[PDB]
Amino acid sequence: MQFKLILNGKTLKGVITIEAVDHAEAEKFFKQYANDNGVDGEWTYDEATHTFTVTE
Numbered sequence: 001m002q003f004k005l006i007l008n009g010k011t012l013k014g015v016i017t018i019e020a021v022d023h024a025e026a027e028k029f030f031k032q033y034a035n036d037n038g039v040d041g042e043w044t045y046d047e048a049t050h051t052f053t054v055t056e
């Protein structure tokens with residue numbers, strides 16, 4: 001499956017797409033990915049579009 005993360009940071013913006021075999025695994029990956037980017041934000045998920053957002 002494919003999932004997207006929109007990073008809406010104060011000083012960094014991004015869009016990342018991954019392949020994953022599980023929805024919760026994708027969430028866990030993206031949370032670690034944002035943490036590793038130094039991005040600390042609030043989260044959303046939209047199942048219709050397979051899109052996570054993190055907003056600082």
Ligand SMILES: [Zn+2]
Nearest residue numbers: 022023024025
């Ligand atoms: Zn699952």
Ligand SMILES: [Zn+2]
Nearest residue numbers: 001023047050
């Ligand atoms: Zn789905």
